[PDB]
Amino acid sequence: MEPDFFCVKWIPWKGEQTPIITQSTNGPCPLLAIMNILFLQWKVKLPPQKEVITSDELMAHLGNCLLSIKPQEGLQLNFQQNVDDAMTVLPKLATGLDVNVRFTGVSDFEYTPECSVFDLLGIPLYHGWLVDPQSPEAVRAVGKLSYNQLVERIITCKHSSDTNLVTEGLIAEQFLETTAAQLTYHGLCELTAAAKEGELSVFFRNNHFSTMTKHKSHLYLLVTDQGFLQEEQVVWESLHNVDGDSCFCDSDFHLSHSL
Fold this sequence. Notes:
The chain is α+β, with helices and mostly antiparallel strands. The chain has helices at residues 31-41, 55-67, 77-89, 115-120, 136-142, 147-158, 164-178, 185-194; strands spanning 5-13, 16-22, 52-54, 125-127, 200-205, 208-215, 218-222, 236-238, 248-249. The PDB classes it as hydrolase.
């Protein structure tokens, strides 16, 4: 109930009573997105008694998990740096992380130190925010620029003497006005296609981090919402429609219905 305390839903996962962390805040900290993936993979175990958990608790669990990862062609020297780099930006996942997306593919983002937690834990970060290839106008306008970059450029555009840069200026502005809930249809398709069937990942949209997976060839996000705390029958929520209706499922990915 209080601000760095979170509630522990217990749910029958791959045979066993498994914990999962619920947030009503729906913030921009990835800790739960990552942590939930870990509890699901059973890399972290909570005593069954357990009801609430602190940030500081999760944070410990995560640090020991990272320092516990056995090395394995991969990065050689780049591994050991990767660990130290993870360790040095580890205390920032608490306070939550700004992500600068690229519109160019579901896996592309401007690299930041926080990306090392994900990269090391074998967790992919994906996003849905892709510029469609049906509008060659806008693909070229936005181009290979980053988001925080696009806004910089849009502004230096409104002020250019070349009118063509105010054309691109207004095109790029347009795409952001239109695609502002940050999942294009194109995004969804590409991202559906792209995730490994079965594998747990982290889905970014509207400064929010979610735990994702692919199943029977569609996407589902784990239900961190706290309202559905009592309801174990409620775990996954479909991500089939870009904007529309969700069908809640039990851990076995079959339909469930709330009290």
